[PDB]
Amino acid sequence: MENFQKVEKIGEGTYGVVYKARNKLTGEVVALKKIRSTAIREISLLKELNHPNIVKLLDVIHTENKLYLVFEFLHQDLKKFMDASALTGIPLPLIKSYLFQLLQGLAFCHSHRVLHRDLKPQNLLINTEGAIKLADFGLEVVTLWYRAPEILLGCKYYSTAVDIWSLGCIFAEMVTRRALFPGDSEIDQLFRIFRTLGTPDEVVWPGVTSMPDYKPSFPKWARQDFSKVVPPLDEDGRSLLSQMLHYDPNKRISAKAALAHPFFQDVTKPVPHLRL
């Protein structure tokens, strides 16, 4: 750590505190994360998971029983960018570009059997070049808003499909400028999903009733059309979103397959208006 100079406290919570810092030698600006063995080997395997849409992990510093992660620095997260776009919302071309890039990023980690497990606007970082990247991979006050239903129902060995679900929720949020399922407890989260997509059963989700936390007493809500869930979204988008929000993790579209959906027929890479 003697090689770094803390510039300011970026973010906080969860895995630790994050600071913007400068390398006392090179002057290189980075994101320094102070984390609060197995972890070591797992984190190291991450330094190899390099992709343009994955915030690059520069170094892993383990000293005095303390773990420091040095990352490539990005100037803003999606949360802040959405809040700054609330008045007019993010332009479709830019929403589509971000989704396309994240799917590319996911298709890559998934191919390497790595899942993020906690995708959310706060850990999606953007630059002035129009790129968006996945941050805070890894392996209270944490948002459950983007949690996949299988996790909520107690699935112990959930798949990469959970990242697809989270991304679908983020997609809907960019389009409507409002969180899709803002649960404030695990059961509320589950019930918000149920009220919108319908209480899942053996028909739409084989085996769902045999899940750890599934209760036969769950209220039975009927599904709602996506025309009502994300109105402005054209048919291609609504079609893709519905496949990203499928209950059956085995039926949920994969990232790679998602990249082939017609919604991306006219995908481009616009530049956002960032006021750093």
Ligand SMILES: COCCNS(=O)(=O)c1ccc(Nc2nccc(-c3cnc(C)n3C(C)C)n2)cc1
């Ligand atoms: C409460 O205040 C929120 C402010 N959000 S922000 O001002 O738009 C903002 C968020 C993140 C960053 N920079 C950043 N770059 C690389 C990795 C990283 C990183 C590495 N590990 C983590 C957890 N992160 C971030 C997601 C914090 N954070 C710069 C500015």
